[PDB]
Design a binder for these strands. Structure first.
Lengths: 204, 89
RNA sequence: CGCGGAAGUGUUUUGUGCAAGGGCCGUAAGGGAAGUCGGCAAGAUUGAUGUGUAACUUCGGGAGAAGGAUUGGCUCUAGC
RNA sequence: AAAUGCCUCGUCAUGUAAUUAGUGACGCGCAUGAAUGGAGCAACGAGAUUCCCACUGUCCCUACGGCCUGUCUUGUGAACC
RNA sequence: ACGCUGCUUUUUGAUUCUUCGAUGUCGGCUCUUCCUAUCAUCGCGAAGCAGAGAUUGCGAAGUGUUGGAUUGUUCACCCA
RNA sequence: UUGAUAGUACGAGAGGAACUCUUGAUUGCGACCUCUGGUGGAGCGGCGUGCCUGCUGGCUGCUGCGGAGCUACGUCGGGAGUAUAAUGGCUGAAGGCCUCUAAGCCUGAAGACCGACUGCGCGGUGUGUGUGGCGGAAGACGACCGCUGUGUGUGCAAGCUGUGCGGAUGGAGGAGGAUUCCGACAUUUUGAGGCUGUGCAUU
RNA sequence: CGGACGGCUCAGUGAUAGCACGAUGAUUUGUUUGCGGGAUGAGCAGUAGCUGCGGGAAACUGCAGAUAGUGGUCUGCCCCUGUGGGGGUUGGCAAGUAAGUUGUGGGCCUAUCAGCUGGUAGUUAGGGUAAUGGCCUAACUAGGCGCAGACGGGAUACGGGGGAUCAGGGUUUGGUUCCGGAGAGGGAGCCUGAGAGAUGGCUACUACGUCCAAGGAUGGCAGCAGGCGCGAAACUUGCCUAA
C-alpha cells in the first residue's frame, strides 16, 4: 500500500511506498492510533508517526465513528466526512469504510510527529511558505507586536522591511458609522415623545 | 492462518473450522460451532453470556479496542511566507 | 385414574461384564411416501379459558365443525 | 360397465410428468327393475374405497447408544430322531 | 416370392415311466453363479460410404445394462 | 465428459469430423479420522414432581450443550510385460503367368497368459520359544502383541461446561414506629466453580 | 432571496369535495405599510474559496497547511421571584394579505339491499396541537341512527360558473377557457422553511428497468416539441433580449 506522508511543522508532503512484508504490521489499528516509524522501513526510525485517513481500492474513504473493517452506508448530512452538500437541508445515503486498517486500504495518510536523527529527503529539509496572513487587527498586532496605540496598524508594518498586506480596514469603518447614528435616532424618538405627553396632559 | 472472527462470541476461528451461512439479503455470517448457532436460533442476546467479548466490555470487564498508544508529541517551528523569510519579531 | 409416598407384608450376602445374531426401547444431516398389494409401523394432535365457526338437513342437528390466540414465578388491586 | 356388463384395460371428459385405479356423463342392459322390494345419505359405523393438508428412519442408506438374552462358570438335568 | 432342408428346449400340446403310510403348490423382495443366438463399450469388413448421422457383416462374454405412474400379477403400456 | 485440434479436412451450399495433448466427474474395490456432520445411561448447566422440618446439600423426572471412541453425509489410492483372433500386408511355388500360404515372415483386441497384490502347504539355515503374574494398539472362548516391580495416587499441560457457597449494595410493592420486618430476581467479589479415561513429570 | 406560484391531467372521491348563508370570544401569518426595539466587552476554539499531496471504469470523494464571517465560555443586559433563588440571550404592537379549523341545507340509479354501529354515543381528568374536538389515552355510564330510506351494492361520477333543445310547464348534459379540489408508476415515512407530508427534494419496500473494467453506480414527459403502442378516433423535434 502506497503511503502519503506529511510533516506539518515544515508543511510538506510526498508519496512514499512500501512492500507487503512490513505492510502486515499495520493491521488492526484505529484512526488516531500511532506508533514508532521504524516498523515501515528503515529511514523512518526514531520517529513518531500518526494515522489520519485512507481510501480503498474503489475510492471510498475511511471515516471515524464506525469501528468496523467492512463497508457501511449511513445517511449523512451537511458537515460530514464523505458528503459534499449543495442544497439546503438535503441528506444522502453514501458508502464509507470503518476506522480500522486491513488488507482493503489502498493508501494510508500519515503524520510525522517527531523527526529522527536521520534525514528523510523531501520532508525534513524544506520549509515551505505560509499561504495567508491574518486580517483581524488584534491578531495582526500580536504577530509583529505593534502596541504603541497602533495609530495606523497597516502603515506601521509597511515601513518595517514588496509584500502586499490586505486587511479588514473598510469593514471596521462601515459598522463604526452604523452604530453611531443609531444612537442619534434613539434621542429624537424619545425627545419628541415627551413633548406630546405633557401637551396631551395639559388639556386633559 | 485465521478463517475469520466469530460473529456471536468475538473470537478468532482457525483455518478450516467454521460454517458460513448466507441470508436472503446477501449477508454471510460466520459462526464457530453448534453451541453458537443454537443461541442464535433461540434469539438470545450475546451480552447476557459472560464468556463472549461483547459481554465483557458491556460490563466493563475489559474493553476490546485499545486506542491511545502513548501519543506524546508536540512541535511548532515557525516558517516564512514569500519574502519575509527572516521575520525577526 | 395416571405420576410419587406411608402402614402392613416379602427378601439375600463368594458365577461373568458384557463378539456376531436376536427380544423390548432412544437419538439422527439434507430430502419428505420416491417405500409398499395397501401410509403397515412410527411420528403427529391432546388439558383449560377468550375468539371464530360452512355445505347440507328428518329443523332436533351437523359442532369440540374447520381456523386462529393465551398459559410460569413474584408483589399487589377489585367483586361477594 | 354399479359388491349386478361376457366382449372389456367399452367410449368421451376430468385429477398426474406419466392413470388396468377414482369421480362425472353416455346406454339394445351376455344376465338391471319395483315388500324377490325400486329410487333415495340427514344422523350414526374398530365396515369397503380414492384424493388433499399435516407429519415422520416407510424409503434414498444407514450410523451410534441403553437394558435383558447369547458368549464364559457352578448346580439340577430332558426330548424329537 | 413360389418351393425345399435343418437346429434349440425358452411356448403350448401329445403321453402316463417315477412319487398318493405327502418332495410345501403363483409373483415380488434378497443373493450368487453360468450360457451366447452381442444391446453398449474395444478391434476390423461392405455399400446405391463426399462429410455428419445411421444401416448390414465378422473376432469378442472382461465390465456394465437405472429411477417412476396404473395392475396381485408374469405380461403390457406410457413418463424421465 | 471440458478445452484445444477447428468453423479446419469434406461440400455448389446447407452443414461439419479425426489421431495426438488436456479438464473434471459417475460407479465398483481397498483403506483412514486432520477437517465437517451424526451418536455420546461420560461430564457440567437449566427447569420441575414427590420425600428428608425450611435455607444450604441430596435422591428421583424432563431438557441444552456435549470431549474420547465409533462412523458417512467427510478425506486418500491403479502394468505402457510376452504371445495371439478377425482383418490388412511381405517373400513365394504348385500352375514359365497369377496369388497374404502350401515352407517361412511382419503387424494387430475392453480378450488369453504372465507380472504386481492377498492366502495356504512344503523346504533350507553359524538360528528353537518366560512357569506364573500384570497390561494393550489384540480379543466371544482359545489365540496374538508387549514387559518382567515403574504401577496406583497427586501436580502441571491440554480440553468441556459456563460465572459456585457466603457476604455486601439494590429490588415491583406491602406491613407499621423499629427506621424495623416480608420479597421473585439483579450487580459485584468471580472467564468463577465443577469435571476429564488424553500428554508430560514425580512419588 | 426564490424555486409551496406558474404549467399539465381527471385515477380516487356520491359528500369528509363543491355552491349558498354563518362561527373563529378556539388560531398562526415571510415580503407590504405606520410605530417601537438593537453588546462596538473579555478569553479561547476554529471553516469555505485559496496553496500542495492523492484515490476511483465511473458517479463521486479524502488528508496536511494557512485565513474573513463564525461557534462556545465568562462579563454585562433583560424575565419570573425575594427576609431563598431560578431561567433566557433579543424574538415587539396595530393594520393589510394569506392559511387552518367548524354549523345547517340541496333529485345519479337501486328494497331480487331492512334493520345497522365497539372509540361506537356520552361524562370526568390529563396529553398533544398554532388552535376547539374521541383527535389520543385512563376511569366510569349505555347510549347513537332508521320507510321523511338507515346500513349496503351498482353505472363511462372530479364539483360549480356554464351548454344543448324550445309556446308554456319540462328533458338532457358539463374530461375541456374562469374559480375550488385532488394527484405526479404504486404505497408509506420525513428534512429545510413564514408556507410542503413537495416529487424538474431526500429515505425504504414494491412494478418495470438502465450503465459497468463486475466492485459498484443509477431512472421517473398526467411541462413544450417528438417517438412507440393502442384504437373508429386527434398538428411543429419551427421563430422570439418585442406585447
Amino acid at each position: 500500500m502506497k503511503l502519503n506522508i506529511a510533516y506539518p511543522t515544515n508543511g510538506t508532503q510526498k508519496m512514499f511506498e512500501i512492500e507487503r512484508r512490513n505492510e502486515v504490521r499495520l493491521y488492526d489499528k484505529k484512526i488516531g492510533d500511532q506508533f514508532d516509524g521504524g516498523i515501515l522501513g528503515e529511514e523512518f526510525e526514531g520517529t513518531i508517526m500518526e494515522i489520519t485517513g485512507g481510501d480503498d481500492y474503489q475510492g471510498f474513504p475511511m471515516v471515524s465513528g464506525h469501528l468496523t473493517k467492512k463497508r457501511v452506508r449511513p445517511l449523512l448530512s451537511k458537515g460530514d466526512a464523505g458528503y459534499r452538500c449543495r442544497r439546503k437541508g438535503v441528506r444522502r445515503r453514501k458508502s464509507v469504510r470503518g476506522s480500522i486498517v486491513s488488507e482493503e486500504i489502498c493508501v494510508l495518510n500519515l503524520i510525522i510527529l517527531r523527526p529522527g536523527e536521520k534525514e528523510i529527503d523531501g520532508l525534513t529539509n524544506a520549509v515551505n511558505d505560509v499561504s495567508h496572513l491574518p486580517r483581524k487587527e488584534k491578531k495582526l498586532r500580536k504577530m509583529f507586536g505593534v502596541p504603541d496605540e497602533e495609530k495606523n496598524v497597516v502603515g506601521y508594518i509597511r515601513n518595517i522591511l514588496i509584500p502586499k498586506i490586505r486587511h479588514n480596514g473598510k469593514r471596521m469603518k462601515r459598522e463604526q458609522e452604523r452604530r453611531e447614528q443609531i444612537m442619534k435616532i434613539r434621542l429624537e424618538r424619545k425627545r419628541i415623545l415627551e413633548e406630546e405627553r405633557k401637551e396631551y396632559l395639559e388639556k386633559y | 492462518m485465521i478463517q475469520g472472527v466469530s460473529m456471536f462470541s468475538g473470537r478468532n476461528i482457525p483455518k478450516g473450522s467454521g460454517i458460513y451461512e448466507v441470508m436472503s439479503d446477501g449477508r454471510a455470517v460466520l459462526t464457530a460451532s453448534n453451541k453458537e448457532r443454537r443461541l442464535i436460533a433461540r434469539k438470545i442476546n450475546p451480552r447476557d453470556i459472560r464468556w463472549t467479548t461483547s459481554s465483557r466490555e458491556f460490563f466493563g470487564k475489559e474493553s476490546q479496542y485499545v486506542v491511545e498508544k502513548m501519543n506524546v508529541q508536540k512541535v511548532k517551528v515557525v516558517r516564512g511566507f514569500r519574502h519575509i523569510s527572516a521575520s525577526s519579531l
